[PDB]
Amino acid sequence: KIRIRLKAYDHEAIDASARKIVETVTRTGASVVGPVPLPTEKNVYCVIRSPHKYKDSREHFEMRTHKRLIDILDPTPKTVDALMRIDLPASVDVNIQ
Amino acid sequence: PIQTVGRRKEAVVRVRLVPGTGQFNLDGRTLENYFPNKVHQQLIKAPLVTVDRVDQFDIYAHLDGGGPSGQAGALRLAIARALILVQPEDRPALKKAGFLTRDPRAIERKKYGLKKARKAPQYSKR
Amino acid sequence: AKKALVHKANKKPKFAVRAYTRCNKCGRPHSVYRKFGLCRICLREMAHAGELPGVQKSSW
Amino acid sequence: MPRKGPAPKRPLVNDPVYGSQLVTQLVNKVLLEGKKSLAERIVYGALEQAREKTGTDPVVTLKRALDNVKPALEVRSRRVGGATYQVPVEVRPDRSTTLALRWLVNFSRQRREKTMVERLANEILDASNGLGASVKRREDTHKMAEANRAFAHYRW
Amino acid sequence: MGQKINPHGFRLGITTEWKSRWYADKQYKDYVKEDVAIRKLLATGLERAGIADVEIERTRDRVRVDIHTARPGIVIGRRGTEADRIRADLEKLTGKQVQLNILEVKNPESQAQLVAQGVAEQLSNRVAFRRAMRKAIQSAMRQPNVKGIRVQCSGRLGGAEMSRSEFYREGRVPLHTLRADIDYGLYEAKTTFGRIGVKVWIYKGDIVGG
Amino acid sequence: ARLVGVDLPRDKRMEIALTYIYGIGRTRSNEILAATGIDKNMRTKDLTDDQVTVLRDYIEGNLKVEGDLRREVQADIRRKIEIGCYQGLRHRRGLPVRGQRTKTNARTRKGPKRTI
Amino acid sequence: KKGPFVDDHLLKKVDVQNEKNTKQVIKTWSRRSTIIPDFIGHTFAVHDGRKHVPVFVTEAMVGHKLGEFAPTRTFKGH
RNA sequence: CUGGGUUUGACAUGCACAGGACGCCGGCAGAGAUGUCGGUUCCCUUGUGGCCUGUGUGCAGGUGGUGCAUGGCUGUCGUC
RNA sequence: ACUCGUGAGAGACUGCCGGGGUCAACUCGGAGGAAGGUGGGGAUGACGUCAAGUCAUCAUGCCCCUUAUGUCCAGGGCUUCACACAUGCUACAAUGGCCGGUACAAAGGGCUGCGAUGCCGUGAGGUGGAGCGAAUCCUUUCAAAGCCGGUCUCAGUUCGGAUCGGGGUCUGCAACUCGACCCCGUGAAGUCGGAGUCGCUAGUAAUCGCAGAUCAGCAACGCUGCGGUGAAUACGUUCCCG
Ligand SMILES: [Mg+2]
Ligand SMILES: [Mg+2]
Ligand SMILES: [Mg+2]
Structure with missing residues (x-):
């Protein structure tokens, strides 16, 4: 499958990025896709703060990283350029699958 | 054309019930090539076994996600919904077996500090 | 741990044997974990502020 | 469920090639942590071997063996007034069938033969004939219940 | 004292805002470094002047600071002696300019951090901590668009040796409720005997803020 | 054969x-x-x-x-033991040569689990 | 992989020894030249400041310091 | 931990004595620190601002102790 | 017209009926319904005990060192060992081992990193570039358990893989003390385990692998998330502990 397995650092940031992508593509007037339900995961962060005997109150404090995906088909170079021209947030570390 | 939807833990399926000869053409694979366990065959036939319409109606499904059992359950739910929408009189014949509803049982959210979901770490007394 | 030493130790050093941490925030050559290249003080400051890439503390 | 009430029986559909809730329960019990198709093939081979050996209905032979090895009394242990008593209480059909299937699978895994299919076939044959480890354990449990029958007056 | 989690630290992305809202690839380190440097530089000054929040934002190689002063007049004195002085100090300590822009608060008693600063100053001024907390609670509950308050001054109260943590509350201060919009303030007071902790909670209202 | x-x-x-x-x-x-x-x-x-x-x-x-x-294995072992290296010392002491755990493990090389 | 402390002198000595294919000990003077792959097990008599001990270098020894097989800082305690 | 260095110190800041060279790239003695040599010699502008170089000065520095003095964070009891 | 990863709305509020209950809360069954009686699962940790953990995250009152206990450098140590305790992996064999052919899952690590086709290699891999601040590229147009065929004939063995010797590889200047991986041989304990004891109530246990936190290079079998296939019990609180 395709589009996409990425990750972000802020739910607000990622949802704003999805919204602005939808807005710019709809303004270019190309199209939209059919969203599907899929949950997020819990990242792996259980780091200590001191090398001393901190083994009580030790494990972690989850770093909430909510991620959303938007699939797409039938490529068009115009949409390719409209989507690759710029990224407003730039904080969502997107990764290609 | 009539079309329904079936959902599972992490899988979805869309079918279009139409008359003809009984067959299951999956996304690029056939019935025996998609259900080799020989139990998912019986599971997805149960909706068509309670009411003998196995070789009477066609099944052109398109699924995505999950595994063998998940896809089997999704296709069963899709066939159940199609039978609900086509033949309302046969709806009890399918509800009596435990169909027409997606089993709420699904994968939960694993907990922190544990090995798996509902599994505490082993520790010996001292 | 000043600007001169930082610039001399970050780029190609004179001898390859000089491959110490040389943090960029405080500049101390040692007492810094190369796991993140930051001294514990600023490391935990950013951890508590929510800026460092993925470090936190007690919740269980 | 525990301390709340009974559990709802799973409305499982009868086996397609055998049509026996007891057979499906035996399959679910002998299932080895997900080996569904493997256990199904194993039980099918065992029933085919039992058929080739006897010359009758496999389902009927299995039902007869289960009815013959069904324990009619299972001992327990209850403390009444600061004293342990192994009072025997009336068992239910489902519990007796489950215990019989457990003993059968245990003695089949304990049997030393070539393959698991042959082990299960020979175990079923012995249970049907009346000379097997399952029948021996049933007789031992019956003897224990008859010996401990001296203390049965509570029915709490 | 207790294991209660910081409401601001918990709702930093739900209800409350972030003091450092920027992003940079490989430069976030230097960004937060300059941020904490400016914070340490302004610590004494803006603490003697009264400070509530210092929101720092990063732009194309420049900075955008917004400090919330409570008592304008001490930090903003003569034009070219205090404000410009601190500005030049920050500029020469950092590697860029500083277009400092101060923003005045609407009510010092409504901000948790300011209430904590005031109660800590009162305690350090050799006064009765009980009366100080009572008067602070009265000022913060004299209808400053509020609905609840909870003040706590832990540590060596009254210059004693026992860590007395007086739990004083008034109104409604729920911690498990998410739709609270509660402001929190954590302060560390320095005395001639040691350190003292000040934990404040101001439940303004039941505003959603979605 | x-x-x-x-x-x-x-x-x-x-x-x-x-x-x-x-x-x-x-x-x-x-x-x-x-x-x-x-x-x-x-x-x-x-x-x-x-x-x-x-x-x-x-x-x-x-x-x-x-x-x-x-x-050949025998000759190589005795030669590396006679040269007087880390491998030779470990072979003489009955300890692992590849430098692995020796606190409680290494019984495969130290023989049966002896306690004295 | 930049230019390491290969001890160009020892490097060329080992090169000519490999070219002529004469199995003999090579009297060296450095202690930190075990990097370049051109050293085909050339037995170096190393100079630790006291004497020259003949020790042949092995596979796991590839990389380690020249004079590090035996403890160069002679000390036992008894 | 073993042994050689720097020791107003690797690294911040106020007060004095001389400076335009520290600062940059390589060579030599060493395991390297370190010492030394070769190419550049400041930017303002006469009041001196910045720089360090050598000598003093208050001090830096402590992952040294004291959580039976604390701030902050939080573990079992107890998600009862 | 099809699964509405972005926003909102509807749908569970005992909504209605009956047995009830003090015709007051509240309990069971039934109708519709995806969930019916806090829907399944978490975030959410009150006053306080353990004078609980932290002065090595940081500050911290007091004492102490200052040609030193501040700082760098080369080597060694934290990875040592005749033993014991704790947690995990390998298994102990036929629901098995090896070879050949085959299908779906969610989760991304990427800018001095990922790196597909090819050359040659038993194999780590030497050549390397189309493509990437984000679906043209590896993690495949996605794996293991799973299905078909051949073989081993139920044994210290084609189970198990450790020690050990020979032939090499990935990183960085430097891998016996100082990682991992590959090829050949070497083939030990282990025959499901006593006294004691641990975890599990439905997508739970079990079993299988995928991915990530930091590293140029790994001790990572660990810790976190993911899902593949997925069971039996639930007289009851006499009883061990809270
Ligand atoms: Mg101590
Ligand atoms: Mg103590
Ligand atoms: Mg055997």
Whole structure:
């Protein structure tokens, strides 16, 4: 499958990025896709703060990283350029699958 | 054309019930090539076994996600919904077996500090 | 741990044997974990502020 | 469920090639942590071997063996007034069938033969004939219940 | 004292805002470094002047600071002696300019951090901590668009040796409720005997803020 | 049968029967059979004298004899023990040579679990 | 992989020894030249400041310091 | 921990004595620190601002102790 | 017209009926319904005990060192060992091992990193570039358990893989003390385990692998998330502990 397995650092940031992508593509007037339900995961962060005997109150404090995906088909170079021209947030570390 | 939807833990399926000869053409694979366990065959036939319409109606499904059992359950739910929408009189014949509803049982959210979901770490007394 | 030493130790050093941490925030050559290249003080400051890439503390 | 009430029986559909809730329960019990198709093939081979050996209905032979090895009394242990008593209480059909299937699978895994299919076939044959480890354990449990029958007056 | 989690630290992305809202690839380190440097530089000054929040934002190689002063007049004195002085100090300590822009608060008693600063100053001024907390609670509950308050001054109260943590509350201060919009303030007071902790909670209202 | 000084099993495939030699095993025997043009599914009771001789000379030419390898291992061990290195010290003390855990593990090299 | 402390002198000595293929000990003077792959097990008599001990370098020894097989800082305690 | 260095110190800041060279790239003695040599010699502008170089000065520095003095964070009891 | 990863709305509020209950809360069954009686699962940790953990995250009152206990450098140590305790992996064999052919899952690590086709290699891999601040590229147009065929004939063995010797590889200047991985041989304990004891109530246990936190290079079998296939019990609180 395709589009996409990425990750972000802020739910607000990622949802704003999805919204602005939808807005710019709809303004270019190309199209939209059919969203599907899929949950997020819990990242792996259980780091200590001191090398001393901190083994009580030790494990972690989850770093909430909510991620959303938007699939797409039938490529068009115009949409390719409209989507690759710029990224407003730039904080969502997107990764290609 | 009539079309329904079936959902599972992490899988979805869309079918279009139409008359003809009984067959299951999956996304690029056939019935025996998609259900080799020989139990998912019986599971997805149960909706068509309670009411003998196995070789009477066609099944052109398109699924995505999950595994063998998940896809089997999704296709069963899709066939159940199609039978609900086509033949309302046969709806009890399918509800009596435990169909027409997606089993709420699904994968939960694993907990922190544990090995798996509902599994505490082993520790010996001292 | 000043600007001169930082610039001399970050780029190609004179001898390859000089491959110490040389943090960029405080500049101390040692007492810094190369796991993140930051001294514990600023490391935990950013951890508590929510800026460092993925470090936190007690919740269980 | 525990301390709340009974559990709802799973409305499982009868086996397609055998049509026996007891057979499906035996399959679910002998299932080895997900080996569904493997256990199904194993039980099918065992029933085919039992058929080739006897010359009758496999389902009927299995039902007869289960009815013959069904324990009619299972001992327990209850403390009444600061004293342990192994009072025997009336068992239910489902519990007796489950215990019989457990003993059968245990003695089949304990049997030393070539393959698991042959082990299960020979175990079923012995249970049907009346000379097997399952029948021996049933007789031992019956003897224990008859010996401990001296203390049965509570029915709490 | 207790294991209660910081409401601001918990709702930093739900209800409350972030003091450092920027992003940079490989430069976030230097960004937060300059941020904490400016914070340490302004610590004494803006603490003697009264400070509530210092929101720092990063732009194309420049900075955008917004400090919330409570008592304008001490930090903003003569034009070219205090404000410009601190500005030049920050500029020469950092590697860029500083277009400092101060923003005045609407009510010092409504901000948790300011209430904590005031109660800590009162305690350090050799006064009765009980009366100080009572008067602070009265000022913060004299209808400053509020609905609840909870003040706590832990540590060596009254210059004693026992860590007395007086739990004083008034109104409604729920911690498990998410739709609270509660402001929190954590302060560390320095005395001639040691350190003292000040934990404040101001439940303004039941505003959603979605 | 007699190949280089060791006897093969009675009823076993060639790739498993050739494992009895101190210098030939499953994959080594498979490669030898592939190079000599002999099948691997044959039992150990239908061998020919010509095949025995050809396999013997082929292994003697490519590899060396079982006794050769045995005494070579012995000579290398005693040499690395006499030079006086870390490997020699560990071999003398009965401890692992590759530098692994030695607190409680390494019983495979230290012998049975002795406590005194 | 930049230019390491290969001890160009020892490097060329080992190169000519490999070219002529004469198995003999090579009297060295450095202690930190075990990097370049051109050293085909050339037995170096190393100079630790006291004497020259003949020690042949091995595979796991590839990389380690020249004079580090035996403890160069002679000390036992008894 | 073993042994050689720097020791107003690797690294911040106020007060004095001389400076335009520290600062940059390589060579030599060493395991390197370190010492030394070769190419550049400041930017303002006469009041001196910045720089360090050598000598003083208050001090830096402590992952040294004291959580039976604390701030902050939080573990079992107890998600009862 | 099809699964509405972005926003909102509807749908569970005992909504209605009956047995009830004090015709007051509240309990069971039934109708519709995806969930019916806080829907399944979490975030959410009150006053306080353990004078609980932290002065090595940081500050911290007091004492102490200052040609030193501040700082760098080369080597060694934290990875040592005749033993014991704790947590995990490998298994102990036929629901098995090896070879050949085959299908779906969610989760991304990427800018001095990922790196597909090819050359040659038993194999780590030497050549390397189309493509990437984000679906043209590896993690495949996605794996293991799973299905078909051949073989081993139920044994210290084609189970198990450790020690050990020979032939090499990935990183960085430097891998016996100082990682991991590959090829050949070497083939030990282990025959499901006593006294004691641990975890599990439905997508739970079990079993299988995928991915990530930091590293140029790994001790990572660990810790976190993911899902593949997925069971039996639930007289009851006499009883061990809270
Ligand atoms: Mg101590
Ligand atoms: Mg104590
Ligand atoms: Mg055996």
